[PDB]
Each structure stands twice: as C-alpha cells, then as structure tokens.
Amino acid sequence: PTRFSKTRKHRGHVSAGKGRVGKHRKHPGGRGMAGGQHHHRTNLDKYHPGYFGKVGMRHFHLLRNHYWRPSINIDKLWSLVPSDVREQYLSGQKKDTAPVIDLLSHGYAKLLGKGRLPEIPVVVRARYVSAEAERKVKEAGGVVELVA
Amino acid sequence: AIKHNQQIPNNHFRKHWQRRVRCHFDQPGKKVTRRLARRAKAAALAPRPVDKLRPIVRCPTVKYNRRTRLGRGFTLEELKAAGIPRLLAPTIGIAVDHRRKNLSEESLAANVQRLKDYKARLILFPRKSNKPKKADTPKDQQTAETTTSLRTSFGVEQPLAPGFTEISKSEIPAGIEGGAYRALRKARSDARLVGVREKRAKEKAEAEA
RNA sequence: GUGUGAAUACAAACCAUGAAAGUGUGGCCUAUCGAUCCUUUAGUCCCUCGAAAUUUGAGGCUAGAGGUGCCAGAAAAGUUAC
RNA sequence: AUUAACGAGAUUCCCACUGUCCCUAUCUACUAUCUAGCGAAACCACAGCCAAGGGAACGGGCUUGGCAAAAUCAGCGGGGAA
RNA sequence: GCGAUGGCCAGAAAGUGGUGUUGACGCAAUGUGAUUUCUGCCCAGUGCUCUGAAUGUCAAAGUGAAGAAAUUCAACCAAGC
RNA sequence: GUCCCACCCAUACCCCGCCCUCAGGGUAGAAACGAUGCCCUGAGGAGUAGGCGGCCGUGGAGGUCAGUGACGAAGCCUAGGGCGUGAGCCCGGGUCGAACGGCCUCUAGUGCAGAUCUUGGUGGUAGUAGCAAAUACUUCAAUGAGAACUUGAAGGACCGAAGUGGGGAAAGGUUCCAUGUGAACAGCGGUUGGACAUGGGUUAGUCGAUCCUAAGCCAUAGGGAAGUUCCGUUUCAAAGGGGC
RNA sequence: UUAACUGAACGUGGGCAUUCGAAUGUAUCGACACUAGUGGGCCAUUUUUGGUAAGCAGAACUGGCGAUGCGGGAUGAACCG
RNA sequence: AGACUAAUCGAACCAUCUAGUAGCUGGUUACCGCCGAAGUUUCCCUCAGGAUAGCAGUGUCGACCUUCAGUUUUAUGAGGU
RNA sequence: CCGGGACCGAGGACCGCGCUCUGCAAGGAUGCUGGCGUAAUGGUCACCAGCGACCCGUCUUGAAACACGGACCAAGGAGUCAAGGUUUUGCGCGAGUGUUUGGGUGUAAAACCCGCACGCGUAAUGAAAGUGAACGUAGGUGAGAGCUUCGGCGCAUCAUCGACCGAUCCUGAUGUAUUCGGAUGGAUUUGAGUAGGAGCGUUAAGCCUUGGACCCGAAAGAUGGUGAACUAUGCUUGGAUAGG
RNA sequence: CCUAGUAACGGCGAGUGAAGCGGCAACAGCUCAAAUUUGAAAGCUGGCUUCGGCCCGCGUUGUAAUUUGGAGAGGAUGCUUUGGGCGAGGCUCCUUCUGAGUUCCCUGGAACGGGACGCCACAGAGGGUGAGAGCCCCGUAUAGUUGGAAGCCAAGCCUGUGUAAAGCUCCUUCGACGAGUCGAGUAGUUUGGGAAUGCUGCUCAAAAUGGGAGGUAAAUUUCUUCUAAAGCUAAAUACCGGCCAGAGACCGAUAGCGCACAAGUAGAGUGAUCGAAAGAUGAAAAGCACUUUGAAAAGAGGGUUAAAUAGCACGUGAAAUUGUUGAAAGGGAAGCGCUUGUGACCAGACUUGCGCCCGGCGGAUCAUCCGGUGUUCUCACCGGUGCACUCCGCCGGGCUCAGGCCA
C-alpha cells in the first residue's frame, strides 16, 4: 500500500529528506563488499571477527547421508508411547507388562540421557546409546539392546 | 557498502537475469488440461485399469533404509517362480524389469505372494467370442464389480514397522556382559587394529621357523 | 577502551648465586620495529586420504623464521606548442 | 668558405614623384532622409536620473541628501561590470 | 644489400602474389643538395659486421646410476651471450 | 566635565479573554454514554539539515445511501454570498447538452514555478532594420472594375562576334503549343507568366544505340577456408569445326 | 598462612534510632532496541605562537552567528537590551 | 602541411552491445501540530570521498524505586605557572 | 480616611468560606430610560492619505548582489518493483508449526477438501576421528512487584560464588589378543552451551545489498556494415592556349 | 519441489557454485557386425505386359530366414497357441427451427423518462432503434428436431486349419561379442573437478577372465559393479513467430505500438539508413429558394432546424495576446503590509410568541362505569353509557412576560 508511506509526506520539501550538503550521489564508497581490508576494516572487525583466513582440512565429495543420526534425550522417552496407554502405566494398573520402544521407527538413531526417569521397567532398541543414558535406564529395571 | 551490524549479503543478480524469468500464471489452466487427458485415456481403456502392477522395494541408503516404496518391475526370477511366461506378462498389465536381482530371500518371498494373488483376481476375456479357449473366463463370472486405480487397491500396506510392542515382565532379555556402551567401543577399535595385529602375529610364525 | 610495539604484578615447574634473609622471566627508567595468502624448520607419535590393508608421498593441529621504511602492509617510465 | 643569373623572400641609403603630413577645402553618382506598397531577427527576472555611506571590500532598488511635469524626430558610442 | 635454391615487400591460408615482358650502365634502401675551392683528429661508450681452436654459461628430446615405483642425481649439450 | 528632577517607547515584565500541546483528577446496585464522550484544575509555545503524528484533494475496485438528472448531468465564466487557522468545501447568476456524487474499506503511472526541462501556441522590440552590383527610360492609342513593369506605332539606349547571337554532351522530365482563369506563388502591382484549369504535340534500310577491342571485371579446370567465400583467366584439363 | 585456632576472607547469634547523623534543589530515575543528518566552519573578552604589519596564518576555557525575528548604534550575519 | 579521404580527419559515416560508468554540476510537486543538530576522535594511494565514536528522533519496559547534581560548606592529598 | 479617570463582564438552579446577621459589596453585572426598525450598524471592491517594505530558486562561513538559471501561457515531468536479510506493531496455533510441487471437486483463472515427504525449531562442541548436559525440593548470598494465617513465601530482572557437557594440558586403577584399554582425581585455560523449552506461518513501517535503481549528462572502448559525384595518386582514350 | 547458497573453486580478494538419495507428472520398449541355405540367392531396381507372367540388370569382395548377452546354439521331453469375413450402437463437422405489452395519461423535436395496469423467465450476457427498453428487432438459456459428407471405436455373430510357425521345463557340453580405437606423455581452452572434469592437436600404441569406473600422486595383495569404440523410438517440457478465439481493479487522441485517418505514407540522404503531423456538424443535408448592392470575393433582407450562441475555417471553446463600450489613476518605475475616509454594490436580523380574563360561533364528548383485545401485570386502546359551570377548534376585546440596532 503506497497511500501511506513516507514518500508521500515529502512532497513540497526540496531534497526529499536526503540532505543539502550530501546530495545522495550514485555509489560513494564502492559496490558490494569493496574495501574490506582498506577503508571498511573498522566495521568488519567490530562485527564479523574472522572473515579472512583459512582453517582446517578439506573434504572432497561429501555425502551427508553417511552422517545421519538424530538424537533424543531420555526425559522425552515416555512421550513416544500413546497417551491412552501412557496414563495406565504411570497411574499403576498394569504391574506385570513392559513396553518395547523402537526408536528407529520414530526417526532416531542415538539415545542420549539428560533428565530423570520414573521407576518403571522399559526396553529400548537403539542404534547408538550414551554411557550415562545406559546407567539410568538400567537402574530403573530396564535394558537397552543394540539393533543396527 | 556495509554500514551497520548486518548479515553479509550474497545475491546472484549480476547477469542478465531479467531475460530468463518464468512466471506461472497457467497453474490452473494446465490442471484442467491434465484432467481432460486422464478421463479421455480412461474412456479408451474401457474395462482395463489405468495403471500397471509394481513390486515392493526398499530404499538404498543407510538413511531411508527403514522405509519401503514401489519399484519399477518384477525380476525374471520372480516371474518364473509364479509361473508366468516372460512374454505374456507385459500384455496383461504387469510391469517387468530385466536388470534387477534378488540377493536376499526376504524380498523374493514378499513379491511372489503379492504377484500370485493378482493372478487369482484377473478376468481374461477371450480373443474371439464364438470360440473361447481353456485359459479364458467361461462367461459365467465375467459380471462382477471391478477396480480401476490399481495403485490404491495394491499400494504398500505399511511402509514402517510398528511403533512399539508390549510384552509381559520376566520376558525381558539380559544385555551384553560388558554393556551396551562398551560393546561399541570394543568393536570400533578392533577394526582399526585389524592390520597391525595380523602382520605382527604372522611375522612371529616365520620368526620361530 | 580494536590491532602492533613496549611495560607491571602473581600462579604451577626446573635452575643460578649466597652462611642466610633474599634476588633473578635480558641491558637503571623513558625509542631501537611488522597482517591475510605462500614457503621453511622444531614438537606429539596424534588425526584424514571417504570399498579394505602395508610402506613412500601429500594434507591437518600448536610455536618460530623469510616483508611490506608510502612503515594497519597495490606489482608500475616519459612527452603533448596538434 | 665564396658565387654570375633569377625572387609577389627579410633589411639600410640616394634621385624622381606625390594631400602621408604642417591644415584643411570643394565637386559628382548611389544610400542614409520623407511618401505609397511589402515587412523580418538578436535580446528580455522586474525595470531604467545622481553624490556619499555601509555591504560579498566598484548599487538602477537599502540609509541620508540633491531633486522631480504629457506625447515625441535625426545623430552619437560614456554606462547597462551590454 | 643482392648472381635467382637470391635481395626488398604483400597475405588467415593456398598448385597465392608486386618489383618482373626484369639480370649489376640492373633492382631495392638511406643521407647531402648547381658551379668553383676543400672535406682535419678520435673505435673509449651505444650500434653494425667477421672469425670458432676456446668450455666459460646452457632448453626439450636422448644416455647412465639408485629405488618396489612415482621421483631424484650425474655427465654430454644447438643458437645466443 | 560632574550632579539632580520630570517625561517618551520593544514581540521583554504584570492582569484579563480566546486557540492548541502536556500532566494530574471525577463520571454504573446505571433517570445511561459519538466512555474515542463530558466536567474541574495547572504549566508551557522561536528554529535550517532531520524525525514522528493528524488531516485535505485525483484516477479506479467491494458494500451502502430503496441517493441527483432532458421540468437540464458534467464542464466553463463571474472587483455576487457562507464555512474552516490552513490545504479546501458549499450556494446564487450566465453558457451548454448526457451522464454523476456522499459515507466505511481496498488499490496506484496520485498533487509543480524553476532542471540553458519536453511539445504546441503568443508577445515587446516594430509598421522598425531594410528591399541601393550588371549605364535608362519617354509620347499616343487599344483592352479593362483597376496599367511604371500587358499589346501596337514612333523616338532614345545596351550587348559589340573569347556576345545578352545560332546549335550540342552530362543533368532535369512535359517545363513545348493553343484556349480560358476566382484564391495562392512571381519579397511593389498585375488584364501578363516556366503558376492554375481543359485539350494537343516527338514518324528513319542511310543520323545514333546494336558490331570490335583497350585499361579493367566475372564464369569454367583446380587449390585454400569451420563458413559467409578467397585465389586462379590457360594454368599439372580426354576442353574444338568443316564438308557430302 | 603462623612455633601455635595465631591470622585472613566469607559466615551464625546478639547489641545500637526518642534524633539514619552538613546546606539548597529535585519543572524530570534507570536500562534496552532501531535509525536520520553531519564530518569545508566563522566572529568576540582574557591567555598566547610565527611575522615590520594585515579585514593574515595557528592554539586553550567560555559565550555567539550559521539555524533568528524584535527595540537602539543613520546604514551594517557577530556589538548593547 | 599531420595534409586530403562528400561543408566531418592527430584516425570517416550508419545501426547494435547501451538506459555504458561518474567520489562531479543541475532539479526533486498539498496543509497543520510536537521535538531539534554537526563541521570533532581513530584508521584508509585518504585530503571535493567513506567506515567508527559523538550530538538527534521515535518505540518501550522496571519502579513511581525517594535516587540524584556543570553548586556551596567542612576534613584531607597532589602541582612548579 | 476621602476624591477624579481609564480598560474589562469570563461563568449560568441550590451546595462553600464568612460578616456589620428581618439582611449583605461573601465561589465572575445587574437596574432605569431614549431614538431608530432601515443601507442606520456591518461586509466586499476601487482610489487618495500616515508609517513600514531591495528578486525568486540554489551552492556557500557570508546573496538584493558587478555569482549562475528565469520573455509569457497550456498539457507532460522525478525514491518505484522483485529476491534475500534485520528490528518493531496486529493476528492464528503452540513443542511444535507450514493445504495450493501435486491429487479430489466446482455455479470453473474464484471457492471447498485430503495426505506421503520436506523446510525451520526441539543439543552443543572440535581441524578431525569422536564424545555428548540433575551432589541439593534444579544450589547458596544481597536486593525485588504482589500475596499473607503477620510468622513468612517471594515472579521478571541485576550482581556475585558454585555444579554439569565439549575442547586443551596433567594423573594412569581393576583388567588384558602384552599392547591394548582409559576408571578416578586435578589445572591464574577455552565455547555462538545445560541449569522446569518459544518457535512457525502471515500482515504493516523504517533500514541494507545486487539489479537501468530518484531523474537528465561525458572525453572513450568493442562487433558488423556503407562511401573516390568533392579532394589525393596512377592507368586506357580524347580536347584546348592572340601578337611582339 | 527439495537437497543448497551446500561440498568445492578464487591477487582464497571482489566473487562464483554442482551431484547422489527423497516426493510427484507421464510411462514402452528394441535391430545390426561377428556362425555354411550349401540337398539347390530361397532376396531386389527397371522395362514389357493383359494382370498370367516374361526379359535384362544388381549381387557370392555376400542379397533373405535364423541370433543380440535379458541370452542363445545344439540336444532331451509332453502339452499348448496362431488365419479370413460381417457387424448393431456410440463419438467428431456443417446446416434447418424456439417465450412474453407498442395498453392508458403527463413533459419533449423524438419516450428508451415519470405515473397506473399486465405477461414471460433452464432466456434480467451484449448491441441497435430520434434520450436509461426482459416483452420493437438481431441475439442469449435448455434439450430436441430437418438434411448431408468422411474417418474411428466396438457389443455380438459366420466360416478354414497344421506342410508350416510359436510358448514352457531340464542338461554333459559349446557360447563367436566393434582398433590408429582405449590408455599414456605434452600443449591450448574450459569446468565447482582440487598431482590436472570434458574437448581438440602431436609422439608412442595394448589385452582375453580381459577392459573401464570406485573424486589425492606411487608399488604389492583383495573386494563391489557394469560391458565402451554401430543404430531406432510416442508422452510429461519450451515458445504469441504463423492462423484463430476468449478475457482484464490496463491506456482514453502530447496517453496507448512509430501508425484509432490513402503510415513504414509524405519528406531528408550518393548510400547503409532516418521517419512525422492529422479523430467528433445534425435524429435526418432538411448543406440557405427568391429579392437587392457589388467588376468579383462577399454583404443586407428572407428561409430550413428543438438550436445557425451547430454554416463543411462546423459539439463543448479555458489561458497567454487584441478591439469596442463603461469606471478610475499618473512631477525620474510598478506591485505589497497595518489603520481610517469617500463612492459604488450587497448578505443577515426584524415584521411577533406564550399565558391569563371577558364575549361570540361550531362540533362531539370531558370525568365515571360496563364489555372485548394487547401489554412492561399495571399501564393503555376500541364499542357503549355522558348530554352543558366539562372538554376541543376558531373569531373579537383587555392584561402580564419575552423579543431586532445603536446609545
């Protein structure tokens, strides 16, 4: 909508808000990133520290599929089971049956352990598992088994 | 000419981009054209289904390894197991692929069953009405409800494994002796030293002799 | 209150000197000097060459040297009275 | 370094001649001038009398004084920093 | 400067051209500027030109040695300097 | 030079009225209110470059005024009126002849004195500068609305055979001849005209082109070039014409 | 750290307002986000450098013109109110 | 003679790439209300130009925090005109 | 304590403070009277009179300038659009969020419906192989709006001391493919981390970059074509120039 | 669409920049060289022919059948498969036909305007007719109907048949497979391709479980995956150049293409090429008969028209500049701001209102009660009953209060 913008309020005022002494010429200072090391250095060092240089070794023909392994913490583990079944276990009505969770079917490969776990035995099937996560699930009566 | 705290711009707009711009104002007009072609094609193939039969295939990469999808055609070994001639298959709606192989036995068994029941659901009209043949339908069961999509009626039933399973207590197995975390570390370092260990052991055998 | 130069006070090691308390992190104090990219040497015994091994070769991480004196650092000779 | 002949080449002197000059005067033809018919262009913020002062340090316009009477024709080259 | 298998010059190339229907009293490239009388000393510098015993310098290819190879190291070595 | 009385005036100071900005309060057992409203109280107002807020107009789109109009819509003229601080809105009179507004949202090729700005139109200068090379005109009669520059006769002059004479090449293209004529053109006039209107006019065995070659140009045989094409003209070619 | 519960910092508990311990004001308290113009200046009192001097060149504290009318200096961007 | 090559020559004329680039001149369209500047610091083949800090506006939140001050008094230090 | 003169009249039932107290000068002007009821008061336009008043736009420390542009009138005439960022305002859902590449359907470029993948977010750190977030009611101390049984509990946020994960430098237990393995405990080190999630889509404004980029403007550079009717040189074929 | 502004390149400066996987639209596969028909060149261009065939030629330095790596050949073995002819019916193209007022009155030159009364509608899109028309006219919506031409698809029927050719299951054994090519060195160009991604020039020049690739050069040993140096083929995709059609929050004659008009025209240049200006009388020309002045152009009367304030210089006709008439001012500029005066012209406002008393005229109906209905449940309406000191309207007289301007 152009009916309400600052260009409509500049009608009748010479120089259109750009100043008299400095007249808004074509391209003072250069085009793009010109002067990075010569006259725009002061801005390019207060911000963006690290533009210039080389770091690390290079990799030819990287395929990102080799490095696919999303991770999930342990405190969100119980959110994977459906709500109707979930409330039965926490309320304490089953008492003789344990769930077997398949992380791969939900799109995970590594089971990290960050929070706390309630004292109900479970079975987790994961491609990878952390050292701290294995201990917490084991002291709750459960077991973790690699699945590939 | 940067002036404030900004993100460094990279806009590839220095060639003559204005000469090659492809606006899409014919999105709804094109859609009408395709729908006119499908229903025109369906009329030509009056009793036949529009599509063709496809086999079940697993994706080829470690990521997407879990999911399954439709393929291109049945291998020559799958057709032989189900007792279908090679030349007769393409003419009754079956698609054949001659450059695929059955490395495992799990994939072979799944596709054979998927192709065997299709043969039972097929109605085959005779070439000449006055003289039917042995493999033709005897004209008594030619009148039945038919399907035309054959992609929804024969799609993948379930691509992924069930989300979870529920088993009784005291049936939970025992883990690896060392543990899950330590089983991975040992397996990683064993492959690193497979060369150093083998030659050190081997040279000892010649050293003693 | 960015960089370079130079300067002050401690911490953890190893030493010199003196009987000992102590003193010593260059010249009694105020000047005496140098980025990115590239090359070269010392160090650990370390990581990678992406189908799998073993030796050459090459590539990485940390500290010095080769230099810009227009010294916060382009590679550069004249004439026009047509 | 000299040099006969030749030159719409540069320079100095002598004889003849003359309004170049002392020092200006007169005559003739075609214009300028008046009339009938025909009939343009440059230029132009608004305009058009002076003296001093101050001011962007040389005013037609400001301040203090001089002053100041319709409408007009032929010449002129001080000014309009024309 | 040049005796034709040549000197000067044109063209992207050509079984292509100019001088040339030409041959040293000829063709081509420069400086001085009728006649008379003359035209001195300097080869250190910058150019041009000549003579290769000299080994000084020295490319690609080729030869020899080490190594499992990539590769490295040696002699020899045209013109020019 | 020093001292003392009275008196004159700034957009400055004091009191009062009105406008706007800012800050602080009151208003529901609602007899209640464009609650974005109303009432009470206090202080302040200069401004280039620049920032923000509120409003007025122009061309189109959706909704709504059961909107105005051939008994006169839009447009234009008007030292005739009313409203607003202002951009602007409304009405009276004259001319004319077919479409046009108010209110809330949407949308943009949306507001001019300048840029030696673009296109078109018009002034002062101005009835002014000027229409002065090539020796020069005069009397009578006729035509006609009208004669210095139309026609006849008689005088006076110039070009003076390397001519202002008589014929051609290049170039022009009907300008040639007759009859007639309002405007325009012939830098004055015009009955006259190389202008305007209507008709007519260019005859070859002997004069030219047609034939032959010169400097030169282009095909053929062949060779270059990715190619448009470059070279080659007797060249490393099986190349012709005469009689019964 | 000291011969040493001897010190050192940080602590628990308790005591001290009857008056929280100079004047005046508080017509303006703290923090954060985004961005415009500007980066040629000039004049005056006191101090002051080069120069014979300048309506000349160069500095320190503060007030002004630029960005601003009004009343006085007849006139006059900077002087007085 | 830098002379001539269609009034054009110290490198002809016509169309296109082309709306060629400019730290340099010129222009930039209605009204009212409130606030209101800078010519200075550091770096740059930088000195007619840019980045950086400063001055300025608008949008806010935390409390109405009782905190503050281009000022005076009292106690106590430094200086070399 | 008594005179004289000038300017003003805001407000619109009662309420209050008081006095000289059948009342009043005490929270803002009323009473009596005369002429005229239209051009009389008032408003517009033209002219004379007193005082004041240099030409606009622009660059500049300084413009009425002997600094530049401007004879006059009518119409045209200059911060726009797309992609990618960023902060702030409104709106939907919320550990999630986004239908429209595509399919179904339709009164047909409108409207309505459906889902597999995928994008951003939920986990960081190293060059890399790799590893990967609770001693405590998710900690201790000093301030904090609000609540409270009056004892206290204390959001957001500010400062400070600690705990955990990754990297760097030390230490090297139990074990053993006797060279592999890396527990435990430290260190004036280091990170865009954890410590009871805040994000995704859309609307509007300011700002940034590349694009013709607010409008008009060079002296040059490159690709492809057309000219010897002027003039310069040469070739083939013609012509012309008294008398001493 | 995503991967992705990612891996990578780059005075590692300014800058540049792909691919695999994944979802969808559309889907379709194949024929040559290398083998002896060898118990029979079984193949083909051309000419003549009555239509049955004949003749010359090409060709053994290789014309048909058979085979193409998915195989296949050669052997075993039992089953199965295969031609022709009719054909309803349906779909494309052109062409015949389609509902309702000129009813009545007013303004007007002319109703298509205003008022009253009607009808049609699977048709209220658009245009014309003397002004805004569903019913005056062409068309518009719906399925049918008259006639004709040529191609497709296809329900279902009628007849031959194994000399031949084809499919399937197993096997001891065989199993031919593209050369100045691949590859290597060097040079130039190019790419995101980095001890060198593709292309091209020159030198050297292969092999039979052989060869290429596996994104870091080299040697030794394993592994995965395809089969190069011969060839064909629909759909999903691009485009307004050519022939047509339907539309718009686009422009409205200095705009929109240079061109709404006898526009790539007139015109300029030796030439390549450059390139404009210009729409509108009225419903209908009904485009002014006749008289008179003048040499003529034209003028004055008189005519057509609703209008000549529409006369082929024509709808509406602004500003700059000019003429006539009226008013006013002027001693080397004019214009302008504050405040009176004179002259001309002019908008408002006022010209009564309410109440009371007396008198006169006219009407039905004030309090009260009964019945019905509504509603805010206690407030109202209608019908009846009233019947003159009540109520209402008008007129005449008297009185109080207020109301315009300047003092």
Radius of gyration of chain A: 30 Å
- Largest interface in this structure: A-B, 43 and 30 residues
Helix percent band of chain A: 10-25%
> If helices are DSSP runs of H or I spanning 4 or more residues, what is the number of helices of chain B?
5
Order of helices and strands of chain B: HEEHHEHH
Q: Descriptors for this entry?
A:
part of a larger assembly, 2 chains, A: 148 residues, alpha/beta, 3-stranded parallel β-sheet, 4 helices, 19% helix, RNA-binding, metal binding protein, Ribosome Associated Factor, Protease, A-site
Structural features, described:
This is part of a larger assembly, with chains A (148 residues) and B (209 residues). By secondary structure, chain A is α/β, with parallel strands linked by helices. In chain A, 19% of the residues lie in helices and 14% in strands. In chain A, strands 1-3-5 form a 3-stranded parallel beta sheet. A 3-stranded parallel beta sheet of chain A has the order 2-4-6. In chain A, 14% of the residues are buried. The longest helix of chain B is centred in the first third of the chain and has 18 residues. In chain B, strands 1-2 form a two-stranded antiparallel ribbon. Chain B is mainly α. The interface between A and B is large, with 43 and 30 residues. The structure holds 8 RNA strands. It is classed as metal binding protein. The entry lists the keywords Ribosome Associated Factor, Protease, A-site, Factor binding site, Decoding center, Protein Maturation, Proteostasis, NME, p67, p26, Autoproteolysis, MAP, MetAP, MAP2. Chaetomium thermophilum Methionine Aminopeptidase 2 autoproteolysis product at the 80S ribosome.
